């Protein structure tokens with residue numbers, strides 16, 4: 067096979083009391099070391115440490131130095147092949163050794179890297195020893211990084227003449243024109259390395275298949291010389307008749323098969339999935355995909371997967387992006403680093419647009435051990451790795467050169483911004499460059515005079531991302547009519563799932579004794595906005611392409627506004643908690659961004675008789691009538707408004723994008739009946755007063771999963787009363803017992819202020835719920851999860867795994 071899974075049969079040990087510098091030596095004694103499979107994050111397995119050098123920013127989880135070793139033989143089927151060791155990502159500052167000799171060192175923690183080991187392996191079934199030193203000396207990060215070989219590891223095995231790494235570039239030049247003529251013009255550039263010791267003549271055959279595997283196009287290149295140790299470049303054009311475009315609703319991808327021909331014989335075969343799509347950022351009209359105008363309904367996403375830490379998992383990342391798509395999201399910003407290949411696969415298959423972002427710093431460091439100290443020597447390598455990895459991916463629309471980069475106020479920053487966009491364009495000229503810039507925010511009210519160096523950087527990129535800068539959206543468009551503006555980072559409102567504090571108080575960067583934030587859209591950072599305010603500023607302007615809220619999902623670390631407030635260890639920014647459980651604001655975004663009628667009530671209905679409860683309805687319906695125990699508490703409605711260019715939206719006469727009642731509490735059932743303009747019912751939602759806690763209820767998101775050792779079932783554990791109603795403030799400890807053909811990969815409840823382990827077999831409910839993550843093994847069979855709590859009845863669920 068051309069690519070081999072190399073994740074199995076590793077050994078791992080943290081450096082704690084004594085130096086592991088000798089672990090580079092083949093003869094080093096690792097018989098005491100832990101045996102594991104990658105991917106692996108060593109930080110997520112550790113207890114929280116309030117004295118951690120990671121601090122609150124890194125979620126109080128230690129990093130430090132760790133070593134991996136693998137002892138292996140080479141199969142005889144690999145003799146005379148080119149062999150490379152491919153890491154998708156190691157966090158961070160790794161040094162790799164084979165048979166006691168350094169292959170190299172790799173500072174950056176979020177790019178793939180590769181070492182040719184063809185001439186370094188012992189063949190003849192002799193033992194080889196790989197040793198990887200991982201140096202995550204802290205503090206290295208403003209968010210939870212994780213530590214170790216947290217992404218997949220592979221061998222690439224080819225004949226001496228082969229398609230290079232990232233050796234194809236498939237494009238659809240002038241697709242808008244071609245498509246109106248019922249075709250896609252397909253430009254294919256192919257790089258062939260000759261790693262033999264003598265020149266060859268080589269041709270490239272390019273065959274395009276549809277998703278059913280039907281051939282749709284074919285082209286054979288002219289012959290070209292490839293001298294020994296050099297790359298030959300080919301460029302070929304073909305046509306797909308009546309092409310299927312890649313779009314959000316139909317994320318259709320073709321497959322290019324590249325055959326490398328020498329003397330008519332195939333010496334290499336290489337596959338490239340791609341999509342045909344075109345898009346535009348317009349200074350006046352905003353964004354459009356395949357000629358359809360739309361706003362970017364965007365979220366920022368960090369790379370951790372909650373209770374899995376950084377350790378990549380295709381199903382976990384697909385689940386996060388499915389939940390974002392359910393919220394009405396059409397676009398993601400990879401804040402603030404290249405994403406995993408599993409994340410790319412998910413956005414390509416789900417139909418989501420992606421901004422890929424290289425850097426959280428250039429040379430000026432944000433944290434002592436971050437990439438800043440490497441930047442001046444490695445930035446060209448790392449930015450080109452990101453672009454070269456992702457240039458064929460239809461989901462990727464833009465390349466961000468950085469986020470909130472201090473250097474952009476300096477002439478040094480101007481020169482760096484020119485270098486980064488030049489280096490990107492040497493790989494890919496088909497996508498706009500961008501940056502996320504916060505330093506024009508100024509006083510949040512008036513149009514900020516732009517720093518001269520920021521202004522020259524805004525002229526250097528194709529598309530200007532503003533962070534937290536609503537006051538400039540109109541002014542910069544008027545003063546710079548050719549700029550394409552969007553919100554690269556917005557809101558940073560803070561909220562805890564199921565917490566309904568200070569209901570009539572709108573507070574900025576305020577801490578409470580409960581270590582929580584309120585889900586009335588009424589807690590947000592001093593630089594930020596409510597969800598509503600950041601949305602209104604965008605909604606109202608056609609020229610503004612859209613926005614990427616901070617954030618879609620909670621992540622580990624950055625527990626703002628609880629800066630020094632252990633056990634506050636994970637974020638409040640997410641629309642959805644680390645466990646995948648939506649907060650109320652998830653339904654606010656649905657109400658603004660989706661067409662399918664919905665209505666969502668908050669808060670819960672467990673209060674004290676007589677107390678006036680602030681009741682909200684998030685809804686895209688014209689009106690809602692609220693009922694308590696079957697009796698009307700009154701109709702609330704929107705005006706059917708239009709933006710300046712006639713786009714319809716719903717807002718009250720007082721400017722609200724939600725509906726509101728004040729209800730004297732009476733136990734029972736509160737019901738929201740959503741109606742169209744005519745009074746016809748189009749959606750309903752209810753909340754019931756819960757009784758005493760009685761049982762643990764388990765629900766699997768997927769009852770059947772693959773017995774491949776990596777597929778997951780996400781099990782919701784709820785605390786319910788004797789009628790099955792979720793107890794909305796329940797915090798009961800749930801003990802999980804797993805039996806069968808699987809393992810408990812993690813537990814979570816999304817509570818930012820919990821220092822319960824993620825790697826454990828018990829978890830407290832938070833606001834009624836907890837999560838258990840069940841992983842398959844390689845033998846098919848049944849997995850049974852039993853969940854108990856003191857004084858309650860137990861819950862049980864069976865998962866089937868298929869081989």
Ligand SMILES: [Cl-]
Pocket residue numbers: 339340341342458459460461
């Ligand atoms: Cl593509």
